[PDB]
Amino acid sequence: QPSCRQEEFLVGDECCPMCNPGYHVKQVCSEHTGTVCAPCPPQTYTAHANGLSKCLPCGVCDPDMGLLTWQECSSWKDTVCRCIPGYFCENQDGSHCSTCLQHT
């Protein structure tokens, strides 16, 4: 419930500057010290300014769900999946193209 500016995150009694997309918090700020950020390791990403200690694991494209991987995740963006021909997906979620719908 304490409030922080835009692009800060709350840790104990401190509002800390956020890390940029592609980075995670390596060290939280302190009384005398600003945030330390590190780039996402392989197979992880962050797509937004953030206060996460770790980057998020990259998604996998489930071929049982009718998906193929169309583009590999990068450190600032998750794996892009697509449906097989004859399906459509709705990109409405944080999981984006993840369900292969078909007309009846």
Side-chain angles (χ1 to χ4, degrees):
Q1 70 198 307
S3 177
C4 284
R5 302 190 196 80
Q6 276 300 275
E7 293 223 75
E8 308 183 312
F9 67 101
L10 178 74
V11 41
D13 53 359
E14 312 280 344
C15 294
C16 296
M18 286 184 165
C19 295
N20 285 343
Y23 299 77
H24 64 88
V25 178
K26 180 141 191 291
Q27 303 293 338
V28 302
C29 72
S30 71
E31 332 78 65
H32 324 281
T33 250
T35 310
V36 187
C37 299
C40 294
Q43 304 289 308
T44 66
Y45 79 101
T46 52
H48 300 293
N50 71 86
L52 295 172
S53 298
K54 311 199 119 52
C55 299
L56 310 156
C58 289
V60 182
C61 304
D62 198 353
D64 303 336
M65 278 229 276
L67 291 157
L68 58 116
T69 134
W70 198 62
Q71 183 198 74
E72 291 288 271
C73 77
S74 76
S75 86
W76 54 82
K77 194 189 192 188
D78 195 13
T79 309
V80 186
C81 308
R82 298 281 181 260
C83 295
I84 261 79
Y87 295 93
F88 60 97
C89 59
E90 292 170 340
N91 189 345
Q92 61 197 161
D93 236 323
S95 69
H96 306 290
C97 183
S98 68
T99 309
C100 295
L101 301 163
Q102 67 186 318
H103 299 298
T104 190

